[PDB]
Amino acid sequence: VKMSPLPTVENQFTPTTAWSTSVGSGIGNFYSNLHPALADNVVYAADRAGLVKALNADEIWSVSLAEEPALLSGGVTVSGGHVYIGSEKAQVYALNTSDGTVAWQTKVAGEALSRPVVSDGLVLIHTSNGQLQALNEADGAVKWTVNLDMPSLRGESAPTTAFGAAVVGGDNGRVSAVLMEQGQMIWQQRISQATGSTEITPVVVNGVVFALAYNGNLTALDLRSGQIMWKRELGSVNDFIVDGNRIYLVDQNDRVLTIDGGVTLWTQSDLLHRLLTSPVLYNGNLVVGDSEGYLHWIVAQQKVDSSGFQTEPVAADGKLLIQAKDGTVYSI
Template sequence: MELRKLLLPGLMSVTLLSGCSLFSGEEDVVKMSPLPTVENQFTPQQVWDTSVGDGTGDFYSNLHPAWQDNTLYAADRFGVVKALDASNGKEKWKVDLSEKTGFFSRNRSALLSGGLTVAGDKIYIGSERAQAYALNTGDGSIAWQTTVAGEALSRPVVSDGLVLIHTSNGILQGLDQNSGAVKWTVNLDMPALSLRGESAPSTAFGAAIVGGDNGRVSAVLMNQGQIIWQQRISQPSGATEIDRLSDVDTTPVIVNGVVYALAYNGNLTALDLRSGQILWKREIGSVRDLIVDGGRIFLVDQDDRVIGLSTDGGVTLWRQSDLLHRNLTSPVLYNGYLVVGDAEGYLHWMNTEDGRFVAQQKVDSSGFQSEPVVASDKLVIQAKDGTVHAITR
């Protein structure tokens, strides 16, 4: 059976929200909410900005920076990777992972995708060309490069001496952290049609917890690459193929022995870490990562409502609905506030107690697709055109 990756949510943002349509003469199905009027309680300050290559353009990508020891690592889709001083944005080193094709022609794009991950003295990143790279943090030189089972669309996860790569064809692989050698491969199964994106695993007690395009959450024993349990949190239903999409593309969150997972067209579900048994579920769908903090869950649903819930039964604490269909990023907690970016390049700051706006700022006209990153006292976000912005409260 042919497996197809549907360009969603990129499809929604590019074709529906931009004012274009899938077919000539077809009316737009979804319209972006107008920018809400916000009376700023404070003015976030931009400390610096710098360009990292050409960004991601109109391609759906979750490329975002990683931070360690006052150094920020960022990349563009073409293959440029830079190390930046987090204090001032100055370049420490730059490498280009694109392939040399000839003296007069442009290099072949590396098609870097997902986010960067930094662990110890290495940076890890995957590509749509089924390559996983480990770069040395000191100078960006390649420590190893491995061909994996398919497009590596999510960020690599490093745990227990392994680099975990989840590919677009439903394969989870464990690579040796030092050499890049493939230690094991697990097939998580694939439906005929799925969203363009994959869940990055979370790890705890020697197990990797990962979402699949089949609506299931799986626990995999990392030292052997064996599935411990699987639990379905989304059941395909509806009249159309899009209605029946049930991908779990978000990264599960593990807190106090409970796994919190979120599916598209599905449920926010709390699972027992040991058994996979469902503890409770709420009918909320999304492809964006969620936050669990202090007994509360913060998430952006698939219609771009920002929601605060209790970890005790998933009771809704508040709902912010003034950003509908603005193609929000995943949320991040920074200085006690909840922050999301949108497709028009705005950052929206919200009170975590009630979801009310406390600040809003236009940062980049090319817009945002990937979530902000907290780097010490700064909030860092990469725009679609490759510009990296550092902001403080």
């Protein structure tokens, strides 16, 4: 019973696509989080049915780990010499960066829907079963595990690490921190309350942790303890970025910034219900994509591929790369 408007703007910023290629058949009807990862003149990307590739500026290497599909989920994490990808079969595949040949795989006791995280030599996996595993980066072994309460997709938010501990959370509305060295909980606090489905990823900066509840409750808490600094009930379940004392995020209806209080110094209401991607800041400008193939720069907008972008964009080292719901990956 909803519709989105289609605004148009002259494509003054990067008027055209720089190049594109195609990997896989697209996300299809899956909700699983999948996105490319960047390295120096290398893009690591895969479909849900395996098709795991490493490509240079344009495919230099590729393998298929699926039989039955691998049913890969969670995107890809690239750190140091290793790349890790999870799956809904409770497997995590440990690949290298110079040779993508899988070095090992391990069982993580649950669907790997969250983004894998590599921090302080420790691999962090958040499964759909509420169990979080701390694994040895050089092996398939698990150094320790913890479990969170749970009862219905919360989003499987990935952990954010700082100062020796990871910040994790779940569908209980709580955000908590656990030491990196051991499965020891440090502290936990709730962000917002809901009584049921009719009412229902942390970001860390120096001294402050930001969290956004399913129902849009955005808070900033003291990074060291379960104390909220400020809150505003505005937001969605999409990724958001913080920089320049500005919080760039997607609201419940695709509308829309300091970290001092529950204030929004800039908003936008003409992208409503466009199924927007998370915003990124690319070479000085803000860009947000949508399900219709448009990228709007805040100033200019261009259309590349009408199939839509419900995955997250990636930008690094001055280059922007976005993959469509389909297999085609566009660079600029």
